[PDB]
Ligand binder design. Structure first.
Ligand SMILES: [Zn+2]
Ligand SMILES: [Zn+2]
Ligand SMILES: [Zn+2]
Ligand SMILES: [Zn+2]
Length: 75
């Protein structure tokens, strides 16, 4: 999974089952574009804050504003 692979490379560690499951959920259940997830990861990297919770806070701030696809944030 390229996305998981992005996460593990930046995090420098494997995702836990819970994180793997959280990612599945956000993408399928919550219908979040994987490229939107990846751009939250990008933004955490660009901030020098590559940690799970920080990436999720970026995604939550975007979800609050009704943003679930990368086009909505701008491709
Ligand atoms: Zn990648
Ligand atoms: Zn969780
Ligand atoms: Zn959910
Ligand atoms: Zn993609």
């Amino acid at each position: 999974n390229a996305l998981v692979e992005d996460f593990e490379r930046e995090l420098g560690r494997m995702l836990s089952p819970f994180e793997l499951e959280d990612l599945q959920k956000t993408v399928s259940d919550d219908k979040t574009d994987p490229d939107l997830v990846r751009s939250a990861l990008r933004e955490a990297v660009f901030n020098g804050k590559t940690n799970w919770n920080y990436i999720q806070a970026i995604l939550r701030n975007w979800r609050h504003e009704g943003i679930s696809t990368l086009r909505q944030v701008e491709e």
